[PDB]
Amino acid sequence: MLGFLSARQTGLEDPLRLRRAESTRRVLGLELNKDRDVERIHGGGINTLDIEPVEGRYMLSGGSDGVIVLYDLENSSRQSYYTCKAVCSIGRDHPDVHRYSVETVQWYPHDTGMFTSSSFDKTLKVWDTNTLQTADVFNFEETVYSHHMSPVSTKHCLVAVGTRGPKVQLCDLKSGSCSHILQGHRQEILAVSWSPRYDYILATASADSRVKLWDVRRASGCLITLDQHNGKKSQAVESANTAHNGKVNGLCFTSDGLHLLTVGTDNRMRLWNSSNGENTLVNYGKVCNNSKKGLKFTVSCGCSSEFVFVPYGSTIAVYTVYSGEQITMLKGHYKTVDCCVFQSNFQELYSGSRDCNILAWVPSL
Amino acid sequence: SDVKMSLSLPDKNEQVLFCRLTDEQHKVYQNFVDSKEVYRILNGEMQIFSGLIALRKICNHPDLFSGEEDQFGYWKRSGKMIVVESLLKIWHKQGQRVLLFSQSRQMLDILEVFLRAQKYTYLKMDGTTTIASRQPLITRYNEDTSIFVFLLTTRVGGLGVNLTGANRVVIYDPDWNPSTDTQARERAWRIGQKKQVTVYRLLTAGTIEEKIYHRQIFKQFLTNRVLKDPKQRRFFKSNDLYELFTLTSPDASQSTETSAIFAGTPLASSSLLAKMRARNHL
């Protein structure tokens, strides 16, 4: 570290070197901080967490009990020990509270004033953070497994919604049109994720073992359908070209958006070229998931080497994205982990689980 | 409207004549709306559509439904053809040229026979004419003036066959589709029309045909709301608009149903929220 400081100070190395290297070192040293706690408010398992993209100060959390909690992640107290207090909460007494499990919650990108949340009550509610009141509701004919707003699109403000229907619903928060559907999957869509690189590229993963990339502008079906073998087992596309040998219940684009991570109930995680959907054949070993719903996992940002923090049973398994090497397994939960979210400002991780806890993992030293 | 300033467009006026039923026609229509057939229609035991076609035929002419100065299609037995008599006579005295439209080809032939009973020169084009000889007929009507009235159904010929030489146009009977009657009036009044064209839609008041016109206007309003502006003054009643097996012919003491109905004549998450709450309060 003193070598790094000296090399930054004298200009041998770009300051970029020290940032990325020290962030990587912090991530490798990621450990359950009993020096930080998250206030327990959910009566049920936390299905989803979302740190706001701008300023990374506030975090949303949706539980199976239907409540939403809005936490402050900044140590506003002068002590080195603090609890991430719950700022707001859509509780059992809020008139608009979800009737059933909140499966996904997402801050509006570009501003912290709005956030959207979907539930097994077949609703995607848009909330005004300041008033804490719903500003819009999108009813769907079938329960929502996942929704996602594009983190990049300054132009369109569509929400891709995956429900048990075989169709992917696109809901325009700009004047409200929830009619658009992308057809081509054959079973429930368990995950949707917009590319962080291209405004209109959407990757949708479903129960039929397929992941499809769509250009929602385009009127002609999916761009690419991810294939495990890239052509070794080639068939007229009616049943082949599966991304996994089971249900694909998780999606995540890498930070730069040039690759796609999909995790499926075949206990595999695969990395795909997001442009031509080619399997990069990164191994990753065996990534244990048996989730019957969407599995929310994240990648690191702004480190020398990219990581992926994937829920592995009751632990969080940390892998290197481009080599597969399992860095470590963060072990602090008591039931299966549903979601982990990465605070890229400080290389911190927050993981929620069915044990009704949100555990913060902070780098040690 | 926006492109009007680029191209010329002569003014167009339009009227809807309400033609009282003749007493024999009135009796036939009343007998049909009191006969057991419409009662079975109201029971749903028989298809309503024959009742519609029958009532349309009656309003066109009793000889259609029922089947000298007493030959087939005598023009005194229905009020709409009384009015057609008056208009044809006056327009011929004015030296104008007429398009004479009707959805029914059978009554188109009735009207043909009526024109033979008169001394008007005319021309007919319908679906029975071979397509390869359709263009000559139109050209011969458009080029000279020695042909007075051209007979059409609303749907014959390619879309917008060029009938420019005509000056006045009469839609003898309305259709269910607004677009077909709109096309009928548009066919005479196109680009390169020299003289003011006026459309006279012939209605029989208090009958099925008034209801057909009402439905045409309703569909037109629906299309307009969808395509040009949602905010619109509401004209109609659900039950009155949908019940169409009655007879209330005006006695001139009360105004007609149509006139009674027409008696008056990146986002910064706050604009996004503002638009959402605006749409939701509605």
Swiss-Prot record, chain A:
Q: Does the keyword DNA damage apply?
A: yes
Q: Which InterPro entries match?
A: G-protein_beta_WD-40_rep, Rad28/ERCC8/Ckn1/ATCSA-1, WD40/YVTN_repeat-like_dom_sf, WD40_repeat_CS, WD40_repeat_dom_sf, WD40_rpt
Under the heading SUPFAM superfamilies, the entry gives: WD40 repeat-like
Asked if the keyword DNA repair belongs to this entry, the reply reads yes
**Repeat WD: residue ranges?**
33-73, 88-129, 133-173, 177-216, 235-274, 281-321, 325-363
Which top-level group of life is the source organism from? Eukaryota
Places the protein is found? Nucleus; Chromosome; Nucleus matrix
Q: Which pathway does the record list?
A: Protein modification; protein ubiquitination
Name the coiled-coil region(s): none
- GO terms of biological process kind: DNA damage response; double-strand break repair via classical nonhomologous end joining; positive regulation of DNA repair; proteasome-mediated ubiquitin-dependent protein catabolic process; protein autoubiquitination; protein polyubiquitination; regulation of transcription-coupled nucleotide-excision repair; response to auditory stimulus
Where is it mainly found? nucleus
Report keywords, A-Z.
Answer: Chromosome, Cockayne syndrome, Deafness, Disease variant, DNA damage, DNA repair, Dwarfism, Nucleus, Phosphoprotein, Repeat, Ubl conjugation pathway, WD repeat
What are the record's GO terms for cellular component? Cul4-RING E3 ubiquitin ligase complex; Cul4A-RING E3 ubiquitin ligase complex; nuclear matrix; nucleoplasm; nucleotide-excision repair complex; nucleus; perikaryon; protein-containing complex
**PROSITE patterns attached to this UniProt entry:** WD_REPEATS_1 (PS00678), WD_REPEATS_2 (PS50082), WD_REPEATS_REGION (PS50294)
A Gene Ontology MF term for this entry? ubiquitin-like ligase-substrate adaptor activity
Which disease does the record tie it to?
Cockayne syndrome A: A rare disorder characterized by cutaneous sensitivity to sunlight, abnormal and slow growth, cachectic dwarfism, progeroid appearance, progressive pigmentary retinopathy and sensorineural deafness. There is delayed neural development and severe progressive neurologic degeneration resulting in intellectual disability. UV-sensitive syndrome 2: An autosomal recessive disorder characterized by cutaneous photosensitivity and mild freckling in the absence of neurological abnormalities or skin tumors.
User: What is the role of this chain?
Assistant: Substrate-recognition component of the CSA complex, a DCX (DDB1-CUL4-X-box) E3 ubiquitin-protein ligase complex, involved in transcription-coupled nucleotide excision repair (TC-NER), a process during which RNA polymerase II-blocking lesions are rapidly removed from the transcribed strand of active genes. Following recruitment to lesion-stalled RNA polymerase II (Pol II), the CSA complex mediates ubiquitination of Pol II subunit POLR2A/RPB1 at 'Lys-1268', a critical TC-NER checkpoint, governing RNA Pol II stability and initiating DNA damage excision by TFIIH recruitment.
What protein name does the entry list?
DNA excision repair protein ERCC-8
UniProtKB/Swiss-Prot annotation, chain B:
Which residues does the UniProt record annotate as the domain Helicase C-terminal?
A: 83-242
Cellular compartments annotated: Nucleus; Chromosome
Q: Which domain of life is it from?
A: Eukaryota
Q: How is it modified after translation?
A: Phosphorylation at these two sites promotes the intramolecular interaction of the N-terminal domain with the helicase ATP-binding domain, thereby probably releasing the inhibitory effect of the N-terminal domain on its ATPase activity. Phosphorylation is essential for its chromatin remodeling activity. Ubiquitinated at the C-terminus. Ubiquitination by the CSA complex leads to ERCC6 proteasomal degradation in a UV-dependent manner. Stabilized following interaction with KIAA1530/UVSSA, which promotes recruitment of deubiquitinating enzyme USP7, leading to deubiquitination of ERCC6 thereby preventing UV-induced degradation of ERCC6 by the proteasome.
Bridged cysteine pairs (disulfide): none
Q: Where is this motif: CSA-interacting motif (CIM)?
A: 269-281
Q: Which family does it belong to?
A: Belongs to the SNF2/RAD54 helicase family.
Domain writeup: The CSA-interacting motif (CIM) mediates interaction and recruitment of ERCC8/CSA.
Q: Which disorder does the record name? A: Cockayne syndrome B: A rare disorder characterized by cutaneous sensitivity to sunlight, abnormal and slow growth, cachectic dwarfism, progeroid appearance, progressive pigmentary retinopathy and sensorineural deafness. There is delayed neural development and severe progressive neurologic degeneration resulting in intellectual disability. Cerebro-oculo-facio-skeletal syndrome 1: A disorder of prenatal onset characterized by microcephaly, congenital cataracts, facial dysmorphism, neurogenic arthrogryposis, growth failure and severe psychomotor retardation. COFS is considered to be part of the nucleotide-excision repair disorders spectrum that include also xeroderma pigmentosum, trichothiodystrophy and Cockayne syndrome.
Q: How does it assemble?
A: Homodimer. Binds DNA. Interacts with ERCC8. Interacts with RNA polymerase II; interaction is enhanced by UV irradiation. Component of the B-WICH complex, at least composed of SMARCA5/SNF2H, BAZ1B/WSTF, SF3B1, DEK, MYO1C, ERCC6, MYBBP1A and DDX21. Interacts with KIAA1530/UVSSA. Interacts with ELOA and CUL5; the interaction is induced by DNA damaging agents or by inhibitors of RNA polymerase II elongation. Interacts (via WHD region) with RIF1. Interacts with SMARCC2/BAF170, SMARCB1/BAF47 and the neuron-specific chromatin remodeling complex (nBAF complex).
Report what the protein is called.
Answer: DNA excision repair protein ERCC-6
Q: Which organism is it from?
A: Homo sapiens
- Could you read off the lineage of the organism from its UniProt record? Eukaryota, Metazoa, Chordata, Craniata, Vertebrata
Span within the entire protein? 748 to 1399 of 1493
